[PDB]
């Protein structure tokens, strides 16, 4: 009431693209507990890595690392089907417990992180200033990662829809889709947002019949 305890920086986890995703927002009063459900990046993923992050930078690699831990024993499924409920719990002692739970498999992995862990009074302000300085480069990095994932989704989605469509797909259409995907996958290996969007434009146009089918 004369004071508060507040997280001076956001806490969260690395998500595909190497982007920090916040669970506890900066200047939050402890005790506190936020949860969020994530999934797998790739088919038949047996495990997820949980890399824990302090800071306000959109790149995970510009934030302070607090720890990382695996959750294995993910029973095989498609991408983005498993439910991995991640919880940030800071108790009244300034201690953070991060848990990851496979909501099907019942499995659970925690890490506890000392109140004293992370960046001290000085490094904090340096991080906060840095966030405002490189706020541009970060908005850009973010929409590049959002674009990569869209492209990535649209790649995986399309390949699946080529198999379920099987013979229904006119040879021509396949050839054309086949190669637009190969171009996409290459450009996804790049850093060039425009180029990823271009192979995404290319696929939209050549897939128009593959979609007609998939609707069935």
């Amino acid at each position: 009431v004369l004071l508060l305890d507040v997280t001076p920086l956001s806490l969260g986890i690395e998500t595909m693209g190497g982007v920090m995703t916040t669970l506890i927002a900066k200047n939050t009063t402890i005790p506190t507990k936020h949860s969020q459900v994530f999934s797998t990046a790739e088919d038949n993923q047996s495990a997820v890595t949980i890399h824990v992050l302090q800071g306000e930078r959109k790149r995970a690699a510009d934030n302070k690392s607090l720890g990382q831990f695996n959750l294995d024993g993910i029973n095989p499924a498609p991408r983005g089907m498993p439910q991995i409920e991640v919880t940030f719990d800071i108790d009244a002692d300034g201690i953070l417990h991060v848990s990851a739970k496979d909501k099907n498999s019942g499995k659970e992995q925690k890490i506890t992180i000392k109140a004293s862990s992370g960046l001290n009074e000085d490094e904090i302000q340096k991080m906060v200033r840095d966030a405002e300085a490189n706020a541009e480069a970060d908005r850009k990095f973010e929409e590049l990662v959002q674009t990569r994932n869209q492209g990535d989704h649209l790649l995986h989605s399309t390949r699946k829809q080529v198999e379920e469509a099987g013979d229904k797909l006119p040879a021509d259409d396949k050839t054309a889709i086949e190669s637009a995907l190969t171009a996409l996958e290459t450009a996804l290996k790049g850093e060039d947002k425009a180029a990823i969007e271009a192979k995404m434009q290319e696929l939209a146009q050549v897939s128009q019949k593959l979609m007609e089918i998939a609707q069935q």
Partner: peptide, 6 residues
């Protein structure tokens, strides 16, 4: 959702 790698 949002995803992670192993």
């Amino acid at each position: 959702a949002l995803a992670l790698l192993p």
